[PDB]
Amino acid sequence: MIDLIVSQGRVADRAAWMIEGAARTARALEERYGLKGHYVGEPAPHADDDWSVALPQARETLVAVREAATESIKGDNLTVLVNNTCSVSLATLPVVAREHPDAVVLYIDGHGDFNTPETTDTGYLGGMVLSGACGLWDSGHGAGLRPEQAVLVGSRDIDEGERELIRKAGVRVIPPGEATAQAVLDAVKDAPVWIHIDWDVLEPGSIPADYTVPDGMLPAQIRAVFEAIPAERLIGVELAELNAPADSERAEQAVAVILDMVAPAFDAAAA
Ligand SMILES: [Mn+2]
Numbered sequence: 064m065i066d067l068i069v070s071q072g073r074v075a076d077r078a079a080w081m082i083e084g085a086a087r088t089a090r091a092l093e094e095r096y097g098l099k100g101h102y103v104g105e106p107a108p109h110a111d112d113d114w115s116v117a118l119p120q121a122r123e124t125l126v127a128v129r130e131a132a133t134e135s136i137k138g139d140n141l142t143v144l145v146n147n148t149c150s151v152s153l154a155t156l157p158v159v160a161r162e163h164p165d166a167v168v169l170y171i172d173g174h175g176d177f178n179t180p181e182t183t184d185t186g187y188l189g190g191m192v193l194s195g196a197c198g199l200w201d202s203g204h205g206a207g208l209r210p211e212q213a214v215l216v217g218s219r220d221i222d223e224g225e226r227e228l229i230r231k232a233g234v235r236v237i238p239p240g241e242a243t244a245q246a247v248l249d250a251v252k253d254a255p256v257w258i259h260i261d262w263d264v265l266e267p268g269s270i271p272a273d274y275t276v277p278d279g280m281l282p283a284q285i286r287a288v289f290e291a292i293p294a295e296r297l298i299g300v301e302l303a304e305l306n307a308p309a310d311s312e313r314a315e316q317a318v319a320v321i322l323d324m325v326a327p328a329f330d331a332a333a334a
């Protein structure tokens with residue numbers, strides 16, 4: 064009852080290993096849950112190109128992800144996308160909002176990803192994902208997601224300009240220290256739920272985390288969200304931006320933490 068879709072095409076990647084990180088994540092879920100992913104797109108080297116150039120490079124991959132996610136959302140399974148970058152979601156979130164206008168999008172991310180072409184400092188498409196899906200600029204892949212239905216979770220240290228775009232559009236923000244399971248549940252109400260996770264929301268690992276207050280979200284906070292969202296209400300889950308090299312020990316240790324965080328939702332969906 065899980066539909067696993069994996070992006071392997073470049074969508075504006077500026078980091079070197081997020082396509083490999085996607086591949087390693089999908090593999091772990093394949094082995095644990097007895098699935099075989101639908102892989103989409105052809106890998107390409109990362110680059111520091113303007114969104115105006117990277118977005119058209121990505122059209123083929125984005126279109127094929129849209130078709131595969133659309134297929135999945137209209138079915139009866141849990142839709143799980145393992146994405147190299149958040150920018151893949153320029154294709155999926157408009158589908159989510161059209162099939163499920165009442166869906167709340169939990170955009171879990173250390174950043175706001177709410178830049179527009181006029182406000183971006185870096186030109187990075189990954190920083191314009193939620194604003195594009197909400198229609199503040201036109202990505203060429205649709206919009207229709209109400210900002211009132213989007214909730215940023217774990218975001219912090221947002222640029223004052225971008226924080227005002229977020230505020231004016233009506234996107235709620237729940238910082239890591241407020242991001243308990245109940246706070247998230249209270250933001251969702253009865254609605255069906257789409258979960259999008261950029262792993263940079265996570266606190267950089269501390270083994271003795273005992274006496275410091277973390278700035279990012281902890282894995283246990285991610286797991287509690289997945290434990291708290293009722294299975295009948297979960298539309299799907301996007302896992303994005305694991306930057307870890309193929310065959311590396313680090314990728315192996317990374318996907319073990321991911322599988323522990325996602326296990327409550329995926330185990331419920333599997334049976
Ligand atoms: Mn992101």
Ligand SMILES: [Mn+2]
Pocket residue numbers: 172173174261263264
């Ligand atoms: Mn981020």
